[PDB]
Structures are given as structure tokens and as C-alpha cells.
Design a protein around this ligand. Structure first.
Ligand SMILES: [Mg+2]
Ligand SMILES: [Mg+2]
Ligand SMILES: [Mg+2]
Ligand SMILES: [Mg+2]
Ligand SMILES: [Mg+2]
Ligand SMILES: [Mn+2]
Ligand SMILES: [Mn+2]
Ligand SMILES: [Mn+2]
Ligand SMILES: [Mn+2]
Ligand SMILES: [Mn+2]
Ligand SMILES: [Mn+2]
Ligand SMILES: [Mn+2]
Ligand SMILES: [Mn+2]
Ligand SMILES: [Mn+2]
Ligand SMILES: [Mn+2]
Lengths: 372, 372, 372, 372, 372
């Protein structure tokens, strides 16, 4: 491929990265309508350092990789069968989508109430800021996407159980539990983070009863069980604080776009959009106002972003279904459809704006169809 | 006039701006009680670039003009009869006061519900952040004041319908609506922003029905219809989220001060005050604590400001009524009256503070009178 | 006047400031070539609080008034005959231009060397940061413009001799000078700042001799004595560290533009330009790149500004000479003339850019003429 | 490939980007010695929007793409034979390396002196901040790397000749040059930026003589002409203000590493290092102190970065020569070699640190060999 | 002691820290002349965490302890006989004063030149930013004060030789030196930082010769050898870039104040002052302008600070000599003496300011006496 469009552009004369150019057709040769300076809105997990441990791995995309995303960061984590992501907590709230396999999670709230449940493919979980939790993969192992509500998420964000104890005077730990220093001499000298372990037993046998009672709302959500908004070119499954009650700082939508379809032109009136492409290939043009617009290409891995209120669409440019997540740091999901907007205004008023006739306004729909 | 007060000051010996000096009597010759460094709290729309278009004009006062106002910015917009302010949206919430004429506004929410209504002199509107809207002047044309809840409001804040389409691939727009590229070949090549148009028909004929239903709360408010707080020297009309339900981020008050009257000494316990002087002439001293105070003069145009909790008053120093707006970025209006405050404390306690006797405390009023 | 240009704009329908509109013709009705958001680049001293004292006055324009000017601030100071601006020092370096009258200044450096000299109309002075100084007007009194190299210049910037002593334990002052507390009981209880005083004697009688020797370089400069760059429409007097040796952080130019003349199109490749209009009326368009440009009007007082590298010109739009100062926070003055630039390139190359012929390139001049 | 190292890691179970994983072997499977949070230090030009114009193209990597690089930004520009990069200037200083072809550049300084010269493969140029310049490709066309000394470099950074004129009142331009508005009616309505043009004639015929004289120092530099530091595994060509006199804010080094060789372990005691990989494949581990280190892979395009003082090396992991540029925002190039450092200390002292014997210290070299 | 001064103040009624109150007499009962908000200018090393290692200890006072000191940080380091502070480097320049004992230091510059020397009590050293160095105590051990030119100095500031190697792939280290992985298998697994070691031999036997030659300027300085400025109440030894050539970013002064004496009233016209009290007890009032002043007490340890240009003095309030260091981040030491300043001005002019007569001006001295 060459960066040539009509009589514009020229062949590349210096050493280049042909593989990446092939993955970014609309960047090497952008639409003629693209214009102006626009921040980078794309980053691949494959371009990140992968932390390998006995039991799995973890790689992250943060504000240090994608500057525009100051409010959200993400981790792609993998766990082998039975492997455990060590009991820990962090300042940020955590949202997750199980892409592959299944896992058991635990969480205890500030009132001493515990919640333990199994999460399968298509399920989610949300852990409020500061509440301690753990993850243990089941027999198929597990691979999932985690999203934290602070783009600066890093190493100083997570507190591990064994790391805390390893940095607390032995005499203090002993006094705290009413045991002798000798009784805790075998405590780990360093954190585990992720470690291999035998598969757990049935969920029912793990449930712990307590004098504090059951938690008010579940920390897991079966996203694929509910009826999705079904459009002609695909479907959308939404989970925000209105249905997944505990998910107060993260609103999400799983979008599936069939080949030849596209997430329609729209924008969000509430906040920024963070994206993760699960599968397929796409292109999206972000309209930043004042004659500024830039097109980006995305595929599998890839993290995407759409700053607050910017116009956009997500077109499937491949032969397989396009599947991606739309994440928002807010208590609700909300969007304004260009089509629906115009459909709900006087026909002659819209015609006056677009310099088009009734033949165009007649195609407008008062019903919102997310994917066309 | 000369900057002389008693035995202080001297005549100006260098070339000067006599017209402005005459407009700022209390600045050329401040009260003896003024003291210390205080930020500028005054700026005139006449000192701003006026964007002229076919159909009207627009000029703005932002943080780039008045640094102290970081949370609120304003636009003075004028539309000729029938002229349209192009369908658009922005990140900021928008509040408006119709000073002259009338106009029809449209807005569609995130649920596809439309609201269309006519706004006359004395009426307001509030458009939540991100919701698309438009304005079209009626037969008398229109001139109004807009206030946005971000002082950095600028060009990158507003998204125009035609600008978005002009920067979106034709093939994508075609696919989005299910039409051919040929069918949309006449779309504008550049945004319109403000454009001339024939006067619209009756409001009832513009109302659009939809499967989404009517909006929960109106986006317009008839401020002058309600009973105002009537004092001896004037009146105050308040509109905040308690009565104008949708106006969640903007609280406002239209204040009228008769000649020889003044908005009493008070302060706001909730947030900063942004002001716009509709008509008349005034002076206000802002008390910034720790022996700091500065007096400013204001007239017609002029934007004013009072940082959070600073003491102030607004005195009419002209022969005509003084009319101005007090704007706050909050869900409610609130003020503490110096008079009422002291009136509600033990008489001897107040006397102990002021070194004054019963003759003074006897004049205190337990009832709040905004304008005296 | 009305904000109308051809078929654009409309009459003002709301209460307005006609006097200011008349002063800003090119703002009420900007050139058709103006476009885009540009920060405010104009502010009048008449719009500032004037601090009146026994002996004179002082008013300032800082970053709190003109946000764009973060690196430079200014004070318009007036002193009656014999009046003294109290011995003091500040963190910022200070540059001054004597507009009216004359004054005697004193300064002692870090090596204990003193410099005392008289400054008349057209003369300058520069006091390095932290070096203590004073100003005392002579028989005609004095009014001058001071420029400090920090836009945040304020009250916490200046240290007064008597204020320091008033806030130092009496026993410490006594010990410091080897006197008794009784001997210094008459020290002022508060600072003086500016105070009336008898006219001083001849300069020669004030000169103080010392064991430290004479200062290496003078702190005053007779700007009008040197030969100015004389152009067809005016003249320019430049004073920077290359000729006024001590003026290391301030470069300046006094520009005079005859009626019908203009400071040519140019830009500065080194830093921002701060302006003060001494007399006359002008207009200037600042070109901010990427299709952004805004025109401003200026007269007498007025402070102006041109951010680093932005294109500009200053046209006299009055019947009297236009006189203004161009100030830069740098050790040298430098500008690039549009005319000279093009004149120094191959004729056909320039023609290829402008789509103009030899008739245009023939008028280009290889010699720089600041005012045409 | 799979993210597995010994008994750590696991196979990827979700959809992935195999092509990128293959390009980042040391990221999918990092060295066991990597540890801790480290910012991203790699970004590919292929992952950027390419601006196509009639005559060539331009793509950039800025702080908006690579956050860690706050002080330097880069543009990969391509010009067809005879094509011109429009006369312009910017706030940032500009440094360039001609990778392919040749071009003629022009520049006029603040004293009206012009410099015109041809630049071939391996040559450089440096244009001080604010000085106007242009580039015109010769018969082979040209493709080069530009580096600007501000990571925020963007659209508001560059001022185009025709854009300035298009936004200046016609009457002002006419008055500025002493011509009629009619004489300049054909001036472009919009900027050109990059435009096709006939090849220029011989350099000698373009040289323009002037009354200001010749520039003091050349703005171009023949890097490959000088003798490079020749090591066993490659060579280094350095150009900083000590040899390329005008290049005051950019120090550079062209490094060639033969297969099986590596840029030795070292660090820079002066400032951050910005890198551009011209050809080949490499890996580099950046040591960030306090047990933090991360390895990155690089190839052709790719921009790299090494924050100030961090330890690093650049190993050729391919079969072809590795060629890259090391850029520093400083007036000189400087590095400290780990080998040379230890070689210049008492042998027993070094042994005491490393717990190694004379067999190791005997291999240390007092001579610096950049590439081994 | 009780916070009572005349009829002001009262006894403390709640649990208190009597020991600290006794150490801060002028804080529990400030001078009547103190007034206004002033930042904290005092912090004790005894109030910091002490890092203990085999061979010594190290504690620091940074911007995290003393916020006002943003440009300078300090470490109090102790080394046992023969103990070594591991070979390392950092981004900050380092200055040191040997309080007790002696030590041998090494440093190699960017040109491969080594400098090795012994430092005794009263001696200094300065290591430019990024240059690698080490410290090894001699037979008496050593304790010294280090000052770094960045208040944010922390763990991410220092790079250790063994830490770098421990985080570099073994195969890369092997290739870098031309040895086998087996030959370096004994390299430390973790950094040493500070470690015990046998005392070194004579300095002459450690000197390493090289093909690069001797360093241009010494990195150590014998402060107590030069003649100090001798005043009536004490002496001052100054070391800045004018005499200790390499010390470009740190200017210093060792001040000794006899009982009953005081560092006179003065200020610094160049930059902030950072202080370390070696021995004795003192009090200092810092005058911050605009009627703001606060008094602080200091003793042994204690770090002090005086923001740029603020007036101050340092009075010995004990029976033993007061010894402290005055540090400045600049290439020279400079101060303005209140006494000398007034002594160098016309007598009647000074009298006009202070409302004092000839009896006072007669005591002024044209010679600067730092300690009176
Ligand atoms: Mg466009
Ligand atoms: Mg007062
Ligand atoms: Mg334009
Ligand atoms: Mg480690
Ligand atoms: Mg006081
Ligand atoms: Mn977690
Ligand atoms: Mn979206
Ligand atoms: Mn709007
Ligand atoms: Mn109020
Ligand atoms: Mn001064
Ligand atoms: Mn200029
Ligand atoms: Mn350029
Ligand atoms: Mn390097
Ligand atoms: Mn060190
Ligand atoms: Mn001092």
C-alpha cells in the first residue's frame, strides 16, 4: 500500500513498517474529509510489556500509553486453571468483562459482608473503590479485560495482602491477631500477585456465612442474559447503574456489528468513551468540532477513545463480526443519535440546514437504531 | 475628572482616556476604604471582537478576557427576523435570558424526545450539556445573553450539524441513512453557524410527535410571570433548580434596583457570582477578606464577578433603574444578608462587636430585604 | 455605529456602551479577514483601580487583568514635585520610561556600590531583580511607565524599607545597628510607600562616595539621544542589553508612527511583545496561525500584547502621531520583516507562492523599513 | 508466539494481533530482569494519520502520541520532485536529517541575511526558532525526518506565508507594500502548505545578494563527511553546537550497529534522549532506577525515548545493519560509558562492588567504544 | 513556658509537647511584630525516618517534608570506617559539607577522566548532574550533609551500579563486556547502597591514570583554608562558582556566629536560601513583604529556608557558637546588607524615610559586616 489518494500523496521512499501500514489503511490513506490536529485515539495491547507470572500474565494500557484517556485505564489479564490473582484492593473502582473461560471472585465490603460468585464468558463484575477482592480461574482458565476509573492506574494503585503483611512489624501482626511471632514465621517474604493453585471446589461449598448478613446488591452481572437492543446490523447490550446497581462509576455497552454494518453516527452527552476491540476490524472518524476530524483503524486487542461529546461512528470493515466494548465513567449510558435527532425536528427546518429535500427527510427514523 | 481625593492623588499628566475615566468614577477615585490587591472583576462586551454573519452577530466574554471567571463564560448573540443559529451542541450546559425580541428553540434529549417552544422577553432556557438545540428569531428578531458553565468556553466547545457532516466521509453518511452519495451531494461544504431564513409558522404547527413521549421537564422558563421578592428599593426574580427544574448547574436572579436604591450588603455561601448588567449604572465594592477590598463601576453591557463568599453590594449610581443578572454555577440560589444575620443574634452580642448601642441594633430587620 | 458589514451583522437592540464602541471601530465591525478564537490582547489603565497617596498615585495592569501577558506586568505611576516612592526592592527586574517630568533615582548593588542619577522625559532606567531603589520627582513632578518581568507582579512582590523595620523586633534592629531601642523609638509604625517631601538639591550634592567604587554600568539610559532608525512613516528607538548594558531581561523600542503610516507587517522570532500606547490611536491584527486572526483597537493608555512569533502590524488610524512602546522579556530586540524576507528570496520562488508577477516582487525592499 | 517464559506466562486465549506480537518479541516475552511500572517509550509513524497533499505528505509523532516525550516532537515529511513546503516559520527550532533524495532550503535571519543551500542524503539542517524557511525537493524528490524542540508541536505551531496574507486586511497588505488592492487581488485565498512546482535551476543561480551580508554560520551540515567514531561493531557520527555551530538546542548522533553488535550500556548526564529508527530491528532495556526496568522493541519507522540519566543500550537483533538517530535538546552531546567508568576506577574497588575478580576487571577498557 | 505576652495569650489547657515548646520559645511566644500567614520554614532531621544499613545510615529532608523548599533537598549521611556508599549517579547535582571525619570520593566525567580525592572536616565536594561517583569513609568514619538541586529528590533520583546490572539481561551484560554469562554469575542480585568494607590504602595508590587526561577542575574544595570574611561577631566562608569552579548550581556560605552576635539584617537579590544548622541555637524572622513576618527557632540538625528576596537575620540565642550553612541554587553568592544600603544613600534622604536624625545615620557603615 502507498499513501496516495488521487493526485495527493506519494510513494514511501524510506524504510517502513508495511505490516502496520496494512493494519491502518485509513491512516496511511485517510478520508479526504479528515482535517486538523487530533490527539491519538488508538493503542494496542500488543505494544505493551507483558508481565509474566507462574499462573498467568497481565499487560496494561494507561495514560502513560494513551494520553487522551486520563480517566480510564485497562488491564488484559490471563489466569491458568486454578491460578489465583492475590487478594488485594486499590483506590480505583474496577470493572471487568470475561472474554474467555470462567473464574471465581470474592469481595468483602466495609460492613464485613462477603460475596463470592462464579463469572463466565459474557459476564461482568464491578468492585467499588477500596473493597478487597480476589480472582481464581476455574477449569478452563480465564482471560478478561479490567477497566479502572483512573487513567493513572499503576503499581502504586494496588495493595496486596501478603505485601502489606511483609511490610508490617512481626510483633504488630502478632498482636493484631493474638498469636505469637513464631506462629506467623512462615508468612511470605514477598507478595505473590498471581500464583498457581489447585482448582477450587463447588461454589456452594465456598459460600461463607456471617453475622453481618448478605450484601445489598450483587457484584457480578450476567450481561448476555438480558434482551439486547436489536438493530438491523447488530446488537447492543448495556450495563450501567440502572440495571447493574453497584456499577456506579462505570457504564458499559457490548456492541456487535455484523459485516457490512456500522454503529451509527452519534455522540455522548455525558462523558468520554473508552473502547476495547474484542474481535474484528473497524474504522472510526472522530469529529472534534471546528472543522477537526481524524479517522483511526482498530482490530482485536486495540484500545480506542472518544473524548466527551465528539461525533463518531464505528464501521465494520472486515468479513467477520465486529465486537467491541464502549466504556464510560458515569452512572448511566447515554447517546444522541444523529438520525433520531433530525427525525424529531420539523422537516422543513432540517431541509433548511442540509440543503436537501423531502426525499432525504423521508428516510429519517424517530426510533433509535444503534447499529445499521 | 482627576484622580484626587482630599490631599491624596494628583492630576494626570500623560495622554489619557477621558471617556473611560468618566465611566469609572470609583476606580479613578476609589473609596478611602479600598485596599490591597484584588483581581479584575469587570469586562465590557464592547471591548470584544464581534463575529458578524448573515443573519446576526455574536461576541463573547470568557476566561481569556476575565481570568477570575474560570467557571462561567458568556455570549451576547443577536439574530435578525427568521435568522437561525444552526443546530448544534456543546460540552457545556447553556443558560439564556431573552433581553429583546423572541425566538423559537428546539432541543431533543438522549431519549429521542423533542421540545420546541417560543421564548419572549424576560424568558429563559437551559440546555443540559451535550443535548442538541437550535434558535430561530421570530418577527422582531432577537438579542439575548447566553451563559455556559465553563469559563474556557470557546470554538472547540461547539459542534455544528453541517460541520460534522462536512467532515464525515460521504460513503459513511450515505450508509448511515441508507441513501446514495448522489442523494446527499448537495450537503453544505462548510458550516452555516448563523444564517438568514424565512420566518417560521405558528408554534403549534412545528410540534413534532414521537414514540418516545414528551420530555419530563420544560427547557424554557417564564421568569417574569412569577411573583418577585419585592423590597423597598426594587425586586428580585429567582430561577434555580427548585423552580426551573432542568436548570441544575445554573442558578439565576434578575435584579432591578430603583434610583437611590441598592442591592444590600450580602455574600453567597455556595459559590461564585457572575454578573451581566442589562441597563443602568452601578458601583460595587468586593470585600476579599484580610483587609482587602476593591470598588468597580459597571454599566449596560459589562460583565461582573464576585468570587465565592466575598462580601458585596450593588448600588445604583444613576438616574435610571439598574437592572442586572446574578448567575451561579450551582443547583440553588443562596445568600446571607448582613442585616438579617445581625438581626438574628443577641442585641448585646452585636453591640459588643460593633461598639455601637441599642440605637443601631434597633434598626436591624429579621426579614430579608434584598434591595433597600 | 452599528455592527454591520455589508450584508452581515445587525443593529444592536439592547442597552449598550456607545462610547466604548466608538473607541473600538475594528472590534464592533472587524475586518472580513478576522477569524477564529484569539485571546484578548488589550486592556486600558483607565479600567483599573487607582491607588491614591499623599504625593501621587499608582495603577497596574497585570496577568489578573490581561491573562495572555504571563511574563510582564506594568504600573503607571505619578509623583508630585519632591514626592518620594519609598526605598524598596522586589523579586522582579524593573524597567521604566519617563513620559512626563523628571525624577532622581537611587540604587545600591550587591557589592555596596551606589548609583544616583536624574531621569528626564524620554529616558529609561532598569533595576536588576532584588536591588534596592527609590524614585523622587523633581520640580515638575513625574509620571512614568514601569514594566516588571513577571505578569504575576503584585503586593507580595514589593518590600518596603519601613515595612521591613516595622515588622522586625525592636531589640533586633537595635542590635543590628548598635543603638538602643530608645534611639529608634520614632521609626514609622507603618510603611509610607509614596510620601510628600521637599524637592532635593542638585544631583552633584547627592552623590555618595564609597570604598566599593563606582558601578560597572549605568542604570539609566538616554533613549532619545541616540540616532533612531528613520523610516518614511516614522522612527524607532531601540534599547536592549546590547546598548543599555544592564537591561538584561528587557528589550524595548519606542515607536513613532506619523498619520497615514504604519509599523510594517512583521513578527518576533525571540519572544512575546508587550505594548503600551503613549499617544494616538491605532489598530493591529494579530495572526495566530492556522487561519486565526483578530483585530484590536488601541489608544493612549492601553496595554497591548502579541504572543511569541505571531504576525502583526500597527496602523495609525488617527490624525495625530501614534506613539507606543514595544517591550520584550529578552536580552535583545529582534524582528523579521515580511517585506525584507520576501525581498531576500528568488523572485520566481516568491511569485510561485503568491500567484503574483514581477510587478509585485519589483516593489520588495532588501532594506528593513520598520515604519512605512 | 506465546507469552511464556519457562514456567511463567500462558497461551493467549482471546483474539489477538499476531503481526504486532511478532514485531515485539521482547514485549510479549520480556527479559526476566524487567520489573516495575515504566512509561511507554515507543511509537510508530505507521500508527499516525498521514496528511496527503498535492506534492507529498506529512505525519507526526508528538506528546499527544508519546506522552513521555514532552520536549521533542517529530514529523516524517515527503516531497515529490520540485514540490515545495510553503514558506513558513514556527515558535520551535527545527532540526532535520535527509534520509532520501535531496532538497533546496531557504532561510532569512532577523538581520535580513539569506542562506540558500542544497541538502542531500546524510545531510542536516537546523533552523533557529522563529526564522522563516522553505524546502523544495530536487529531481529525486525527498523524504526526511524533522525534529522540533517542543513536544506539544502542532498546528498552532506553524505560520504559513499565504495563510498570514489571507488573514490580513487587503488594504493593510496594499499599504504595507505600496501597491493597490487590485495589484494583489490574485493572492491565494487559502494556504498551500505543500504544493507541486517545476524543478528549480542550479543553486548558484538562486543565491540572493543583499546589503546585510552573509550569515555568520551555515544552517546545513554534511554529517557523513566528517570522520565518525569507529568502534568494532559500528560507527557514530555526532553533530551538536560544537561542530554544527547554529544547532544550539539540538544535539544529534547517527548510529550504525552491525549485525551481532550493540550500542553499549551507557546513560546521558545532560538530558533526555529521543530516537528515530531509520532501518533494522532492535531491542533496548531502559533502567529507570529503584529496581525499575522495561524492554522495548523497535524497527524502521519507530520513535524511541530514554528519559534523562536512565541507563540503556541498543542491541541489533536482526540480520541487517541497525541505523538510528539519538536526539537531545541541549547544546552538546554527552554520555557516560559503563565500561569506561569502571575501567577508570581502582580495580579492587570495582571488585568490591560486583563481587567479581580480576578476570572481570581485566576486560575493562579506558577507551570509550560506543558500539561493541 | 506558656503562650502569654503581656495581656495577650493564655495558658495551655490541653495535653501538650513541653519539650518542643521549650525548643521553640519564639514560636510559642512570637515577637509582637510577627504578622500574617507565612509558610513553614523549619524542619528537623530528627523528625525523619532513618534508613539504617550495614555500614551507616541516611535520612532526608525534601519537599515532602518542607514544601517551601521546591528547589533543594538534603540528606544527612553517616558511614562507618571503610564503609562504602555504592557507586551511583542521579539527575540532580550534589553538593556536600564534611561535618565529621573524612572520606575518599571518586568521580568520572563524560570524557572518561577520573578524579579521586580525600575530603576532611570542613571540606566540600560538588558532583555535576549525571556524573557517577562514590564515597568511602576513612579510619574515623564520616558524617556529612548532602544537598541536591531539586526539592523532589527521592528514590527515583538515584541509580546504583549493581541495581542497573541486576536489571539488565545477563546475555546483554555478557555481550557488553565480551565475557560469558558464567563469568558474571556472581554479580549481586540486589543493590548494596551502603556496605561495609576494609579501609582503603593511601590516596596516591588509588589514583588511576588514563588516556583522557586530568579533569579541568577539582570536584572537592577546602573551604576552611581560605581567608574568611571576618566581622566583629563571627566569620563567613563563601564557596560558589567564582572560587569553587565546578560548583555551578550551588553557592554556599559557612557562617559562625559568636554568642551575643547575629547575622545582620539582609536579603538575597538572586534566589532562595536553604539552611542547615550544624550547631548552636538561633532565631530568625523572615519578612515576606506587605506586612507579613514570622519568627522561627532553630538548633543543631534543623533545616531552614528563606524564600527569594525576603528580609531576614539570624540571631544566636544560645551560650555556644552558632554554626550554620546558607545554600543557594545559583552560580554565585550575593546579598544586600540593610546597613550598607542605607549607609550608601544621602543622609537626609534616609532620615526622611525613618523619621530619625543624624544620630542614627552616623552609625551606618559603608563596609559590609555580615555578622555583628
Ligand atoms: Mg475542513
Ligand atoms: Mg485596610
Ligand atoms: Mg480564514
Ligand atoms: Mg527487581
Ligand atoms: Mg503589621
Ligand atoms: Mn483488582
Ligand atoms: Mn459511542
Ligand atoms: Mn448553544
Ligand atoms: Mn450577590
Ligand atoms: Mn521598584
Ligand atoms: Mn512587533
Ligand atoms: Mn519548518
Ligand atoms: Mn543513548
Ligand atoms: Mn550521590
Ligand atoms: Mn541569608
Amino acid at each position: 500500500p502507498q499513501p496516495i489518494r488521487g493526485d495527493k500523496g506519494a510513494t514511501v521512499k524510506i524504510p517502513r513498517n508495511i505490516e502496520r501500514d496494512r493494519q491502518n489503511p485509513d491512516m496511511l490513506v485517510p478520508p479526504e474529509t479528515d482535517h486538523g490536529t487530533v490527539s491519538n485515539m488508538k493503542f494496542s495491547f500488543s505494544d505493551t510489556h507483558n508481565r509474566l507470572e507462574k499462573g498467568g500474565y497481565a499487560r496494561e494500557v494507561t495514560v502513560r500509553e494513551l494520553p487522551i484517556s486520563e480517566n480510564l485505564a485497562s488491564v488484559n489479564m490471563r489466569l491458568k486453571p486454578g491460578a489465583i490473582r492475590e487478594l488485594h484492593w486499590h483506590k480505583e473502582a474496577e470493572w471487568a468483562y470475561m472474554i474467555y473461560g470462567s473464574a471465581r471472585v470474592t469481595i468483602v465490603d466495609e460492613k464485613g459482608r462477603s460475596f463470592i460468585d462464579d463469572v463466565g464468558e459474557g459476564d461482568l463484575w464491578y468492585f467499588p473503590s477500596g473493597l478487597p477482592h480476589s480472582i481464581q480461574a476455574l477449569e478452563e482458565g480465564a482471560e478478561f479485560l479490567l477497566v479502572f476509573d483512573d487513567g493513572s492506574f499503576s503499581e502504586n494503585s494496588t495493595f496486596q495482602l501478603t505485601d502489606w503483611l511483609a511490610h508490617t512489624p512481626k510483633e504488630v501482626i502478632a498482636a493484631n491477631f493474638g498469636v505469637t511471632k513464631e506462629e506467623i514465621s512462615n508468612l511470605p517474604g514477598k507478595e505473590k500477585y498471581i500464583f498457581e493453585n489447585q482448582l477450587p471446589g463447588s461454589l456452594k461449598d465456598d459460600i461463607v456465612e456471617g453475622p453481618n448478613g448478605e450484601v445489598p446488591y450483587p457484584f457480578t452481572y450476567r450481561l448476555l442474559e438480558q434482551e439486547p437492543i436489536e438493530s438491523e446490523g447488530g446488537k447492543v447490550y448495556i450495563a450501567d447503574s440502572t440495571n447493574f446497581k453497584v456499577s456506579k462509576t462505570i457504564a458499559s455497552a457490548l456492541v456487535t456489528v455484523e459485516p457490512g454494518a456500522m454503529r451509527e453516527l452519534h455522540w455522548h452527552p455525558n462523558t468520554h468513551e473508552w473502547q476495547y476491540y474484542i474481535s474484528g476490524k473497524a474504522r472510526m472518524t472522530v469529529f472534534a468540532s471546528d472543522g477537526h476530524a481524524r479517522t483511526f483503524n482498530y482490530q482485536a486487542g486495540d484500545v480506542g477513545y472518544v473524548p466527551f461529546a465528539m461525533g463518531h461512528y464505528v464501521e465494520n470493515i472486515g468479513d467477520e463480526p465486529l465486537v467491541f466494548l464502549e466504556i464510560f465513567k458515569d452512572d448511566h449510558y447515554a447517546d444522541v443519535s444523529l438520525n433520531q435527532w433530525l427525525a424529531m425536528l420539523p422537516e422543513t427546518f432540517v431541509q433548511a440546514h442540509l440543503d436537501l429535500g423531502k426525499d432525504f427527510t423521508d428516510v429519517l427514523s424517530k426510533e433509535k437504531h444503534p447499529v445499521v
